[PDB]
Amino acid sequence: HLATAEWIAEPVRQKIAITHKNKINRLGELILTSESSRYQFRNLADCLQKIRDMITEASQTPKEPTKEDVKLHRIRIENMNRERLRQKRIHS
Amino acid sequence: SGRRQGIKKMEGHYVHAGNIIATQRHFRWHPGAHVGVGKNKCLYALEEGIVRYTKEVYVPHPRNTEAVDLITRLPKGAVLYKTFVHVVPAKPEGTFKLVAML
Amino acid sequence: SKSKNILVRMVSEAGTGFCFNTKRNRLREKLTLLHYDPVVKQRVLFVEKKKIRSL
Amino acid sequence: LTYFSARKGKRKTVKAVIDRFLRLHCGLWVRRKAGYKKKLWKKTPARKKRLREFVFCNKTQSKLLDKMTTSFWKRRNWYVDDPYQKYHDRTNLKV
Amino acid sequence: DPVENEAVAPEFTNRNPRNLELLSVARKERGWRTVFPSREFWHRLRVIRTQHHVEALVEHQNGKVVVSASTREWAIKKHLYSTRNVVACESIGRVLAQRCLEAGINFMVYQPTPWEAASDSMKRLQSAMTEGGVVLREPQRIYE
Amino acid sequence: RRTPPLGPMPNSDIDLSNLERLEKYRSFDRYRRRAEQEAQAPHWWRTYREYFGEKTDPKEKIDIGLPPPKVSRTQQLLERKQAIQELRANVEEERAARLRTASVPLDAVRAEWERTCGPYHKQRLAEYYGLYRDLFHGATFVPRVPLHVAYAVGEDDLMPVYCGNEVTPTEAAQAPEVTYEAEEGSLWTLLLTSLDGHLLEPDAEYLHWLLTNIPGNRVAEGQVTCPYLPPFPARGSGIHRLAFLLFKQDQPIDFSEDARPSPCYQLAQRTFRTFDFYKKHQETMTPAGLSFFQCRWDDSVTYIFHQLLDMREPVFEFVRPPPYHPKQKRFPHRQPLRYLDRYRDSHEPTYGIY
RNA sequence: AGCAGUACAUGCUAAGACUUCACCAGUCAAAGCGAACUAUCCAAU
Ligand SMILES: [K+]
Ligand SMILES: [Mg+2]
């Protein structure tokens, strides 16, 4: 349960919640899964390493600027044209 | 002293992506839908599906000087035709599967 | 003894040591090229160094 | 091929085969392409890449290589950090 | 115990014709390398110039016409001195770009000939489309 | 062995006796114009159109919409010709065109376009988006009545719906503002349907909104047969079609059978099929207007599932078929070492009995 | 025909195929990364 995680710092829990909202379920539980290995030891180690990267990435405020994925590029152009269609209430 | 060139996959045959449909010294069969061309004019499937041979109107690229000269000298009303080979995609690109119930 | 084209080895100026053989006309000065260099993963100046064979 | 050595009365291995081939425990033989190191200047990148591949021998060749080598060369080995370790056993092979 | 609203089919069926195209996973018709123009697109801009009129179409690779602007239309014709000049070609681009955004069409390919591309009419028509939000270049297909 | 052609062969009318005297194309464009025309024509031989062209019923699509308005062509042509002569008379108009400074008012163009070609262009767009295929099982109507739907985004802004433009679920959280030209005494039905939203049945739809017996343009006074529900496209399910349908009633209609509770948060109760709904009321109401937009998942959708729908949010992924490999053989002659990796399921070393 | 022109990402990697045929050798190639974005042994190192 991310919100009530004493071990994680309160500013970090907020940043993790927005960044990894897609992982948090209806109950507010951050869910991490790994299936990259046959052995449960390696799978569990992958999940724990994921938790560590989340806390580290959260505390590193200057997120590195990087080239967007090709999927993001068109979505940016689509979002830009969608705003172009927005109009203003003529009489308000 | 002979070699084997020609249609590897006949009409209605099932091909996988990368299958060589035909090999030719010169363009005898032209690439249609989902059919790639190699450096040696080899025709290969770009998708999985059924091979089809059709007769389509031929329009060369505007910068293909040799071919553009031919069509410009044709009598008006005359259309060039060529044999094209196509692959009809048999399967969809993918499906949407339920993966989580958050 | 004589050929129209010469096979010569181009060495990268980066000092990595990557070299590739290339063909140039016999009656030409030492060739310099911006050939791609795998070691540095980018294009780099290449200097003609040694004659390998005559075609 | 020597089937019965003069001093031991035992079959002998053809050392020419050991120099050129790798035998996987599953019975496959790996080899290099002929001329992979020769005249690279006159070969296209695509031709050069397939020339440096490690390729399998056919059934007929594999059975011949098996006869030319004694049982020692067919034993299972457990070399440390062997690059071909995973290839010694076949997977999902119905036949 | 089982919520009624939580009944979900294992496979989702999206019948939207543009769904896979919008996601960039729909396959374009590759091939036709020896002939002109290419079929490797989802949507294309085609400009038909006649002796008296200018017409610009946005059509799917399957041959359907999504949106179109033509000087034959009275809505456009009444504001034009001439329907066959550069101004008409620029006006068609501006009108078509607006109709494209309204139809959710943001990307398409333009396949002109060497002389058509050089001409000022197509340069002005292309500029109007780009200034109207149309990119005139499609995103690459996502194979993996 | 030769077989006679099964019809007129191409380039057969061309008289070869006087080849020099015939008129040649002389240009790439003229040949291409003729080439495209010939391709469209039907041919007895096998063509690309056969295998790839869609197979649709030859019978013409039934028209279930309002009748076309009556126009006097003679008077219309008269006024238009006089309008162009007036415009061309101005010296400033000719100078602007010659100097390439003239432009057209986009707003005035769209106003006239809505009155004239707009209904037929909206029908073409609806046909391209499959609305007729999915809503009326291939039946088509011309949206004679321009339907203006806009979503109030914030206080001073409005997100319009223009037949396919993308609107986010956040912008569609509240019922939109709907306006149309209706004469006094008329009664209308307005429904909002999600063609691609249904999570259980492929062919079913969700009734997001249904207003019936609307007197004129007063949408607020229309009976709320189904309360408005925001579009909830599932995450990873792609782009969904949301279509507003305006029906022109011929008389007051009893929609008790189609009524739904207020609030209606049961997906079973909102399961809807426009064809079945229209089929029972075809006698009394005619499809008049059409608007639609494209919607994809956004953060606001999660609120709809957890709060409004009281369910867990379903997530989907686009899954491609597993790569094809030929049946593995015991001896893969001339294949690279990596051939064995194509048929390997685990990357970690295995030890068997040891 | 036992070559030439002219480029220097004739880079890397990798599904699936072809092949004079038996072998050896030879040939084509999607996607991806990065760019552009228009004979054997022998002998020399
Ligand atoms: K659905
Ligand atoms: Mg590629």
GROMACS .gro file of C-alpha atoms in nm, chain E:
model
  144
  345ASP     CA    1  -1.942  -1.196  -0.472
  346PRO     CA    2  -1.898  -1.139  -0.849
  347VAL     CA    3  -1.963  -0.780  -0.954
  348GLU     CA    4  -2.207  -0.759  -1.245
  349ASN     CA    5  -2.024  -0.473  -1.418
  350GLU     CA    6  -1.691  -0.661  -1.408
  351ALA     CA    7  -1.788  -0.910  -1.680
  352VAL     CA    8  -1.529  -0.841  -1.951
  353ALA     CA    9  -1.460  -1.046  -2.262
  354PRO     CA   10  -1.100  -1.178  -2.271
  355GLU     CA   11  -1.057  -1.014  -2.614
  356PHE     CA   12  -1.161  -0.655  -2.686
  357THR     CA   13  -1.327  -0.594  -3.024
  358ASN     CA   14  -1.264  -0.242  -3.156
  359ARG     CA   15  -1.461  -0.196  -3.479
  360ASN     CA   16  -1.333   0.158  -3.538
  361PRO     CA   17  -1.185   0.148  -3.891
  362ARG     CA   18  -0.911   0.394  -3.787
  363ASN     CA   19  -0.824   0.226  -3.455
  364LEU     CA   20  -0.517   0.033  -3.568
  365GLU     CA   21  -0.419   0.317  -3.801
  366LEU     CA   22  -0.434   0.570  -3.517
  367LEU     CA   23  -0.222   0.337  -3.303
  368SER     CA   24   0.035   0.315  -3.588
  369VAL     CA   25   0.014  -0.067  -3.586
  370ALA     CA   26  -0.207  -0.106  -3.894
  371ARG     CA   27  -0.016  -0.246  -4.189
  372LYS     CA   28   0.039  -0.018  -4.486
  373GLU     CA   29   0.021  -0.169  -4.834
  374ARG     CA   30   0.390  -0.210  -4.906
  375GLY     CA   31   0.505  -0.311  -5.253
  376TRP     CA   32   0.441  -0.160  -5.594
  377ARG     CA   33   0.807  -0.060  -5.611
  378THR     CA   34   0.818  -0.059  -5.993
  379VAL     CA   35   0.512   0.166  -6.038
  380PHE     CA   36   0.397   0.511  -5.932
  381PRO     CA   37   0.263   0.628  -5.691
  382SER     CA   38   0.336   0.425  -5.379
  383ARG     CA   39   0.056   0.253  -5.187
  384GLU     CA   40   0.246   0.256  -4.854
  385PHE     CA   41   0.019   0.494  -4.666
  386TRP     CA   42  -0.298   0.510  -4.461
  387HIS     CA   43  -0.418   0.845  -4.598
  388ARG     CA   44  -0.291   1.057  -4.885
  389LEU     CA   45  -0.355   1.404  -5.021
  390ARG     CA   46  -0.442   1.401  -5.391
  391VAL     CA   47  -0.479   1.726  -5.585
  392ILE     CA   48  -0.673   1.722  -5.913
  393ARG     CA   49  -0.622   2.032  -6.128
  394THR     CA   50  -0.854   2.068  -6.427
  395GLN     CA   51  -0.884   2.338  -6.691
  396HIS     CA   52  -1.147   2.526  -6.486
  397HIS     CA   53  -1.128   2.399  -6.127
  398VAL     CA   54  -0.899   2.282  -5.848
  399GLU     CA   55  -0.983   1.985  -5.627
  400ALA     CA   56  -0.798   1.840  -5.329
  401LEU     CA   57  -0.891   1.504  -5.177
  402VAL     CA   58  -0.791   1.313  -4.867
  403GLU     CA   59  -0.855   0.944  -4.925
  404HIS     CA   60  -0.770   0.619  -4.754
  405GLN     CA   61  -0.546   0.364  -4.922
  406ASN     CA   62  -0.860   0.153  -4.977
  407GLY     CA   63  -0.984   0.423  -5.217
  408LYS     CA   64  -1.246   0.583  -4.993
  409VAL     CA   65  -1.256   0.963  -4.986
  410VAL     CA   66  -1.251   1.090  -4.628
  411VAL     CA   67  -1.270   1.467  -4.687
  412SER     CA   68  -1.249   1.689  -4.992
  413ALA     CA   69  -1.241   2.055  -5.093
  414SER     CA   70  -1.320   2.169  -5.446
  415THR     CA   71  -1.363   2.503  -5.618
  416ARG     CA   72  -1.678   2.361  -5.779
  417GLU     CA   73  -1.843   2.405  -5.439
  418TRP     CA   74  -2.044   2.725  -5.418
  419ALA     CA   75  -1.924   2.783  -5.061
  420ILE     CA   76  -1.568   2.826  -5.190
  421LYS     CA   77  -1.640   2.949  -5.543
  422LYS     CA   78  -1.821   3.267  -5.438
  423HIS     CA   79  -1.513   3.402  -5.255
  424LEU     CA   80  -1.274   3.338  -5.546
  425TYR     CA   81  -1.206   3.565  -5.842
  426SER     CA   82  -1.067   3.265  -6.032
  427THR     CA   83  -1.093   2.894  -5.951
  428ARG     CA   84  -0.785   2.785  -6.149
  429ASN     CA   85  -0.506   3.013  -6.021
  430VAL     CA   86  -0.253   2.990  -5.738
  431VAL     CA   87  -0.490   3.172  -5.501
  432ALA     CA   88  -0.754   2.907  -5.565
  433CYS     CA   89  -0.500   2.632  -5.495
  434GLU     CA   90  -0.394   2.805  -5.173
  435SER     CA   91  -0.756   2.857  -5.068
  436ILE     CA   92  -0.835   2.489  -5.128
  437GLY     CA   93  -0.546   2.397  -4.900
  438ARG     CA   94  -0.667   2.625  -4.622
  439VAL     CA   95  -1.023   2.493  -4.651
  440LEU     CA   96  -0.914   2.130  -4.674
  441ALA     CA   97  -0.687   2.167  -4.370
  442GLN     CA   98  -0.982   2.287  -4.161
  443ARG     CA   99  -1.201   1.998  -4.277
  444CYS     CA  100  -0.916   1.755  -4.205
  445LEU     CA  101  -0.882   1.863  -3.842
  446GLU     CA  102  -1.259   1.840  -3.797
  447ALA     CA  103  -1.247   1.482  -3.928
  448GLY     CA  104  -0.957   1.387  -3.701
  449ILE     CA  105  -0.715   1.352  -3.993
  450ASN     CA  106  -0.375   1.487  -3.888
  451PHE     CA  107  -0.132   1.288  -4.105
  452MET     CA  108  -0.126   1.197  -4.474
  453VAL     CA  109   0.119   1.148  -4.759
  454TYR     CA  110   0.149   1.375  -5.062
  455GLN     CA  111   0.272   1.203  -5.380
  456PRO     CA  112   0.335   1.471  -5.645
  457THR     CA  113   0.532   1.454  -5.967
  458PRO     CA  114   0.859   1.645  -6.007
  459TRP     CA  115   0.691   1.932  -6.192
  460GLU     CA  116   0.393   1.943  -5.954
  461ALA     CA  117   0.622   1.969  -5.651
  462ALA     CA  118   0.823   2.254  -5.804
  463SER     CA  119   0.513   2.451  -5.906
  464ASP     CA  120   0.412   2.746  -5.690
  465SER     CA  121   0.051   2.626  -5.674
  466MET     CA  122   0.142   2.305  -5.490
  467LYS     CA  123   0.395   2.488  -5.272
  468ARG     CA  124   0.122   2.728  -5.157
  469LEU     CA  125  -0.132   2.447  -5.118
  470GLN     CA  126   0.114   2.243  -4.910
  471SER     CA  127   0.198   2.546  -4.696
  472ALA     CA  128  -0.171   2.603  -4.623
  473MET     CA  129  -0.208   2.240  -4.514
  474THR     CA  130   0.094   2.258  -4.283
  475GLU     CA  131  -0.017   2.593  -4.141
  476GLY     CA  132  -0.358   2.431  -4.087
  477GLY     CA  133  -0.221   2.153  -3.866
  478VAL     CA  134  -0.179   1.876  -4.125
  479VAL     CA  135   0.170   1.727  -4.116
  480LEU     CA  136   0.175   1.584  -4.473
  481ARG     CA  137   0.397   1.300  -4.348
  482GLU     CA  138   0.270   0.985  -4.184
  483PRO     CA  139   0.423   0.815  -3.879
  484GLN     CA  140   0.608   0.493  -3.946
  485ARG     CA  141   0.433   0.165  -3.880
  486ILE     CA  142   0.513  -0.006  -3.549
  487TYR     CA  143   0.601  -0.363  -3.644
  488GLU     CA  144   0.710  -0.469  -3.294
   0.00000   0.00000   0.00000
